[PDB]
Amino acid sequence: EMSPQELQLHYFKMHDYDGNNLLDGLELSTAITMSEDELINIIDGVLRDDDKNNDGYIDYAEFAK
């Protein structure tokens, strides 16, 4: 079984399809579960809270906060 920190890294890695060790909004859209507008609201929220340099990507530290 995986610990809290392990499942979190697993979730991060499993949705990093291009392997750049960052999550972008498209990758995040697959990592939920809804309409596109609700999806946008959620993703914009994650980026607002996690994406420190506003480049559209978040690394594991930012994702895990």
Partner: protein, 228 residues
């Protein structure tokens, strides 16, 4: 300089390109475009096809850059008709201009496979601006309408072709990875438009068409970046 911000809302890519219902999130598709999990077949290798994919909302970026990765694949040494990349005020979902609407307000970057004027200068990449009143000159491959162009055989290449199109400080630059190698960052200069004027807000788009001759026109990804 400048910095890029990836803009997910104006982008698509695999390996989960389509939603559970086969729609592309944040994009509308029309005509005979076929979305799938790892690419969109914007127009398939059948006779007389038109297809397109356009962003659902307008982008409002002062400066921007798109990286579009695609294949144009056909059995013949000659194919038709080609693929178009768009930034325009309105969605041009259906029409006679590489599957999209004529009389656009903005810029079309046309990957024109078929030499309609017999000038032995295809495949070509042709950049055509429009204010909403110009009809694309299909019979002459837009020759007299082209702001800038290059000759580049983007058909039947072993690795995906890539177009990096940069709108920065009223200039449009087109760089092309010709797909001879798997080096995705191997770009070569194609063309540059000076004093490029485009609408302040607009949809991004991609479209393709075929005629009597027909290639598969596949887009693997359309990645949009805001430049700051």
């Amino acid at each position: 300089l400048p910095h890029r911000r990836f803009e997910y809302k104006y982008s698509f890519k695999g390996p989960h390109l389509v939603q559970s219902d086969g729609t592309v999130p944040f994009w509308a598709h029309a005509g005979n475009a076929i979305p799938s999990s790892d690419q969109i077949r914007v127009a398939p290798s059948l006779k007389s096809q038109r297809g397109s994919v356009w962003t659902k909302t307008k982008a409002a970026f002062e400066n921007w850059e798109v990286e579009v990765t695609f294949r144009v694949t056909g059995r013949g040494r000659i194919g038709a008709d080609g693929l178009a990349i768009w930034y325009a005020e309105n969605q041009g979902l259906e029409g006679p201009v590489f599957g999209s609407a004529d009389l656009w307000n903005g810029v079309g970057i046309f990957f024109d496979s078929f030499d309609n004027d017999g000038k032995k200068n295809n495949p070509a990449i042709v950049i055509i601006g429009n204010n909403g009143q110009i009809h694309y000159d299909h019979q002459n491959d837009g020759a007299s309408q082209a702001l800038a162009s290059c000759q580049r055989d983007f058909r039947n290449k072993p690795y995906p072709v890539r177009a990096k199109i940069t709108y920065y400080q009223n200039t449009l630059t087109v760089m092309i990875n010709n797909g001879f190698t798997p080096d995705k960052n191997d770009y070569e200069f194609c063309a540059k438009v000076e004093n490029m004027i485009i609408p302040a807000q607009g949809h991004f788009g991609i479209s393709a068409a075929t005629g009597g001759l027909a290639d598969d026109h596949d887009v693997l990804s359309f990645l949009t970046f805001q430049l700051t």
